[PDB]
Design a protein around this ligand. Structure first.
Ligand SMILES: [Mg+2]
Ligand SMILES: [Mg+2]
Ligand SMILES: [Mg+2]
Ligand SMILES: [Mg+2]
Ligand SMILES: [Mg+2]
Ligand SMILES: [Mg+2]
Ligand SMILES: [Mg+2]
Ligand SMILES: [Mg+2]
Ligand SMILES: [Mg+2]
Ligand SMILES: [Mg+2]
Ligand SMILES: [Mg+2]
Ligand SMILES: [Mg+2]
Ligand SMILES: [Mg+2]
Ligand SMILES: [Mg+2]
Ligand SMILES: [Mg+2]
Ligand SMILES: [Mg+2]
Ligand SMILES: [Mg+2]
Ligand SMILES: [Mg+2]
Ligand SMILES: [Mg+2]
Ligand SMILES: [Mg+2]
Ligand SMILES: [Mg+2]
Ligand SMILES: [Mg+2]
Ligand SMILES: [Mg+2]
Ligand SMILES: [Mg+2]
Ligand SMILES: [Mg+2]
Ligand SMILES: [Mg+2]
Ligand SMILES: [Mg+2]
Ligand SMILES: [Mg+2]
Ligand SMILES: [Mg+2]
Ligand SMILES: [Mg+2]
Ligand SMILES: [Mg+2]
Ligand SMILES: [Mg+2]
Ligand SMILES: [Mg+2]
Ligand SMILES: [Mg+2]
Ligand SMILES: [Mg+2]
Ligand SMILES: [Mg+2]
Ligand SMILES: [Mg+2]
Ligand SMILES: [Mg+2]
Ligand SMILES: [Mg+2]
Ligand SMILES: [Mg+2]
Ligand SMILES: [Mg+2]
Ligand SMILES: [Mg+2]
Ligand SMILES: [Zn+2]
Lengths: 56, 142, 159, 118, 144, 99
RNA sequence: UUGUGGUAGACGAGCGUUGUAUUGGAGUUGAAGUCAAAGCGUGAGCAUUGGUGGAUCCAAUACAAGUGAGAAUGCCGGCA
RNA sequence: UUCUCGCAGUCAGACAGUGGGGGAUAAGCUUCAUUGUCAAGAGGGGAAGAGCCCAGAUCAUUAAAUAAGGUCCCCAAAAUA
RNA sequence: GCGAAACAGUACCGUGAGGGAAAGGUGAAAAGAACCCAGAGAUGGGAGUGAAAUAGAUUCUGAAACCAUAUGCCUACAACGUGUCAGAGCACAUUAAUGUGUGAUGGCGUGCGUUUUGAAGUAUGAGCCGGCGAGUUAUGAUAGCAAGCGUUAGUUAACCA
């Protein structure tokens, strides 16, 4: 099955109206200050007060 | 006072780049960098480089404060495409169009920057009408 | 034309069952290869015929209107050879006669060489024999200098 | 002598495009759809000039009819009285009177009501 | 050229009215209700500004249908399913829902339009003498 | 205060210092024309036309109306005719109502 | 005064493109091209101003045409 | 609308009324004669309709009188007996 | 315009005979951007040369379709060949013109060519944009119009200068 009529440039944007992106929640590390996405280990391997991995 | 940075023939498609550019328009400098550094998209580590270069040449070349910069407009214009032949079934063939985007980021220090652009458009219109009136005066003079 | 242009006289695609339209050659007029349907040809005539008496009548009226008017002075051999072959003398002559901007035409019966040596670097003025001037050369002149024996030959030619 | 087309097609095409300014999408962008819309719009404009002449008459008749029913008289008899009294006034101006000059419109109805015809 | 006529620029002289359908015929009441709602009887009628007054109808169940129409004339409503055609007789409409009957009758006398929705909205039809609309101070007129 | 005049074929209700547009009258700008046919004046309305009731007007301009493009087209019949019309008018303002 | 719907079709009058011949004129103080604007014509069409552009162009009278694109499952290029 | 000369296009028609043939006094059937419309003709009535009725569009006017048809509301316009 | 303005009968297609493209322009002069900043780099932003760098090697001019950004207006009870005639409100000010941009709402409204008695068409052709694309030439005949020459008229063809 294929479109018997061409879809205009307006129906295309109406369908894409729901294709927008969402900003992931971010927080501040408590030992170095750089922003990291929430509930994940920072770049220093320091999650909370626990040294997870060696520094980058 | 707009500072800007450009990148021609970026491999990312404009469709998949506008989705990321709309996440930073109107945002402050530090917050825009923070948002773009933690988004799992391919067109995030390329807009980040362009944004950083734009900040550098705004606070070094054009002499801007640096604590008032906001992303004025970040867009991905359509770039030149590349045509390849994908071999189909039963002897047929189709054309693959590798899409490229011309990325440009622009930041300003004045939060009223749109007004000056409209002002320049108005000035051009006024000069056209002024030319017409001077020509009319010359026609009647003769 | 369509046949003269180098190309393949075969059918590119089959007549039927292909989604493309019917085609018969790759050098058809509506193709980019280019077969010009009619086009200019190097066999065209461009020539026209006018009767001898009609041409005589045209020449008669043109002489009548050009003659007996301003800048239609009479000239002889003396200044035709007083030019000395130097175009500076003739420039002075045209300046003195106030015929510099005019397209003056010399009508000559004996083909003087000194006059022809001059007036050849002048794109404006020119010299012709009586059997060489035509209607167009006569009415483009805007000014002309006619020799007395040229004038005598004119009444004879008209008859 | 190979005459080549340029600025001839574009000028006459842009005229049609300029006329079809303010249309929906491709109806103002492409020359072909723009040309069709302008022709159709011209037909509509022609037909609606005639239809305007009739529709505004109907509206004046409606307003005049209403203005009369408040006083107990009908449109069908008001025009008859107007004719017998020789008064010649457009329903347009009569409706304009009944909306703008109630007192003078009431004066006209009073004379046509009872005064001797001619 | 000529002088253009005056047309109301979204001017609202709308007022509230009360009528009593004690023994009024359904059609005879509906025609005047539609005329009042549309404002056609108004002196200045601009047909794009809904210059028509509101109306409240009392005693809807007391209206009458002449002849044998209470048992021989049927009102029909079809849902978008198959077999969803519900029929009600004149008597059943006069007893079960009389307000809906008057509402539908008035709606049918209006032009298919985008303003007819607001016009049919301005009709408040009640089945009893009581009404929660006494705060509008509606004037009372008969047989309208 | 008000009058009903008939210029051309249309009827205009005019007040004092009112400028209305009528069909071309062939009169230069600046003259003082006297409209003759008057239907209603003040409160005395004449049946055919009022006698001696004159409307004095001054001509302001002799411009032309907006261009109208009449495009006659017979669908699928090889007929596309085009025409243009710019109807001339004249604008005049009421100065005084002759008794 | 009588008229002016119109397909196939017949007749008449014009517009526009390129070049040539005669005249005149404009142009690095900015030509063609090209975009925009709230202009002029009965129609093909024609101007004015401003931006871009960087070297040719315009008016009149005649002449000669590869002289007018919306359709051909038309050809080529680009893009949906 | 006759005569002479130049240039054509047309040779698939449709429906309505009237008089018939074929069909079954069936066909929006088929074949004729005649009056009209459409073809090549918009407008108003017929709710919507190529052919039915009223008629023939040069353009503009927010002027007036009418034809067929109609006057409770949609939708312009009526009342008496 | 030769298929071929460039290194074209090349690239490429076919076992082979054979078939057969596209692609030109910086600036007067490379003076072709040293140097600084961001970046891994290409590159970009400044600086510099230049009359011009929005002439930067992507290199004369740069159209439309197409894709994005924004001033102003409208749009989430609404049956839509998308327009037209009226029409509030909103925002501006022009080839000064009963001005321009949008259009809450009311009346009316089934595209363009083709071929058919008859197409909105459940017949047909076109996805859109731009370029190209179809009544000619040579030799004769007839007819209309006009000019030259005329009542022992009119006119030359080849060829020669
Ligand atoms: Mg869009
Ligand atoms: Mg989606
Ligand atoms: Mg294979
Ligand atoms: Mg694709
Ligand atoms: Mg060729
Ligand atoms: Mg073309
Ligand atoms: Mg005609
Ligand atoms: Mg020319
Ligand atoms: Mg220019
Ligand atoms: Mg051609
Ligand atoms: Mg027959
Ligand atoms: Mg037959
Ligand atoms: Mg019959
Ligand atoms: Mg029979
Ligand atoms: Mg029969
Ligand atoms: Mg039949
Ligand atoms: Mg036919
Ligand atoms: Mg008809
Ligand atoms: Mg009808
Ligand atoms: Mg007529
Ligand atoms: Mg009447
Ligand atoms: Mg009648
Ligand atoms: Mg009515
Ligand atoms: Mg090989
Ligand atoms: Mg640069
Ligand atoms: Mg490019
Ligand atoms: Mg360029
Ligand atoms: Mg809403
Ligand atoms: Mg609802
Ligand atoms: Mg409906
Ligand atoms: Mg609607
Ligand atoms: Mg509408
Ligand atoms: Mg519709
Ligand atoms: Mg055609
Ligand atoms: Mg057929
Ligand atoms: Mg058929
Ligand atoms: Mg359909
Ligand atoms: Mg089929
Ligand atoms: Mg077919
Ligand atoms: Mg198709
Ligand atoms: Mg095309
Ligand atoms: Mg002849
Ligand atoms: Zn950390």
């Amino acid at each position: 099955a294929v479109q018997q009529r061409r879809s205009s440039k307006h129906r295309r944007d109406k369908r894409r109206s729901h294709d927008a992106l969402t900003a992931q929640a971010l927080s501040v590390c408590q030992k170095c200050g750089k922003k990291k996405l929430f509930h994940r280990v920072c770049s220093c391997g320091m999650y909370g007060d626990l040294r997870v991995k060696k520094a980058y | 006072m707009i500072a800007f940075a450009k990148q021609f023939r970026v491999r990312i498609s404009p469709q998949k780049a506008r989705l990321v550019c709309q996440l930073i328009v109107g945002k402050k400098t530090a917050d825009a960098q923070n948002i773009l550094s933690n988004t799992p998209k391919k067109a995030a580590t390329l807009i980040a480089k362009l944004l950083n270069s734009a900040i550098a040449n705004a606070t070094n070349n054009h002499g801007m404060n640096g604590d008032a910069l906001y992303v004025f407009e970040c867009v991905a214009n359509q770039g030149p495409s590349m045509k390849r032949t994908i071999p189909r079934a039963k002897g047929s063939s189709n054309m693959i169009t590798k899409r490229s985007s011309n990325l440009v980021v622009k930041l300003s220090d004045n939060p009223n920057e749109r007004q000056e652009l409209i002002k320049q458009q108005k000035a051009l219109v006024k000069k056209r009408v002024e030319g017409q009136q001077k020509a009319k005066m010359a026609r009647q003079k003769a | 034309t369509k046949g003269e242009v180098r190309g393949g006289g075969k059918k590119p695609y089959k007549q039927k069952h292909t989604g493309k339209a019917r085609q018969g050659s790759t050098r058809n007029p509506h193709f980019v290869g280019g077969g010009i349907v009619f086009g200019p040809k190097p066999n065209r005539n461009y020539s026209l015929k006018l009767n001898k008496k009609a041409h005589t009548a045209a020449l008669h009226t043109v002489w009548s209107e050009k003659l007996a008017s301003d800048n239609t002075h009479l000239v002889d051999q003396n200044l035709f050879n007083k030019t000395e072959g130097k175009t500076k003398v003739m420039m002075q002559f045209l300046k003195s006669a106030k015929l510099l901007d005019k397209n003056v035409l010399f009508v000559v019966n004996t083909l003087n060489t000194n006059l022809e040596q001059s007036t050849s670097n002048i794109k404006n003025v020119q010299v012709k024999h009586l059997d060489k001037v035509s209607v167009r050369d006569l009415m483009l002149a805007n000014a002309l200098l006619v020799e007395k024996e040229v004038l005598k030959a004119l009444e004879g030619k008209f008859k | 002598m190979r005459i080549k087309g340029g600025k001839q097609t574009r000028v006459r095409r842009k005229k049609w495009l300029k006329q079809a300014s303010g249309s929906f999408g491709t109806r103002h962008a492409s020359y072909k759809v723009a040309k069709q819309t302008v022709i159709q719009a011209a037909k509509y404009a022609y037909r609606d000039r005639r239809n305007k002449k009739r529709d505004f008459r109907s509206l004046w008749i409606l307003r005049l009819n209403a203005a009369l029913r408040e006083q107990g008289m009908t449109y069908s008899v008001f025009i008859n009285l107007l004719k017998k009294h020789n008064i010649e006034i457009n329903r347009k101006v009569l409706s304009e009177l009944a909306i703008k000059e109630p007192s003078k419109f009431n004066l006209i109805v009073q004379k046509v009501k009872s005064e001797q015809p001619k | 050229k000529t002088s253009m006529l005056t047309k109301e620029q979204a001017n609202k002289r709308r007022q509230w009215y009360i009528v009593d359908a004690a023994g009024l015929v359904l059609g005879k009441l509906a025609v005047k209700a539609a005329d009042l709602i549309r404002g056609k009887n108004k002196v200045d009628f601009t047909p794009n500004q809904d210059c028509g007054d509101y109306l409240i109808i009392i005693n809807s169940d007391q209206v009458v249908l002449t002849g044998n129409k209470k048992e021989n004339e049927f009102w029909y409503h079809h849902s978008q399913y198959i077999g969803g055609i519900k029929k009600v007789s004149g008597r059943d409409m006069l007893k079960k829902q009389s307000d809906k009957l008057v509402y539908n009758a008035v709606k049918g006398m209006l032009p298919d339009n985008r303003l007819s929705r607001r016009w049919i909205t301005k009709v408040h039809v009640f089945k009893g003498d009581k009404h929660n609309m006494e705060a509008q101070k509606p004037t009372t007129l008969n047989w309208s | 205060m008000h009058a009903i005049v008939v210029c051309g074929s249309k009827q205009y209700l005019v007040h004092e210092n009112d400028t209305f547009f009528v069909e071309k009258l062939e009169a230069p700008v600046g003259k003082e024309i006297q409209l003759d046919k008057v239907l209603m004046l003040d409160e005395k309305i004449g049946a055919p036309y009022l006698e001696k009731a004159r409307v004095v007007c001054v001509v302001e301009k002799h411009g032309l109306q907006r261009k109208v493009n009449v495009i006659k087209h017979i669908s699928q019949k090889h007929h596309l005719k085009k025409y243009g019309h710019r109807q001339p008018y004249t604008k005049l303002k009421v100065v005084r109502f002759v008794h």
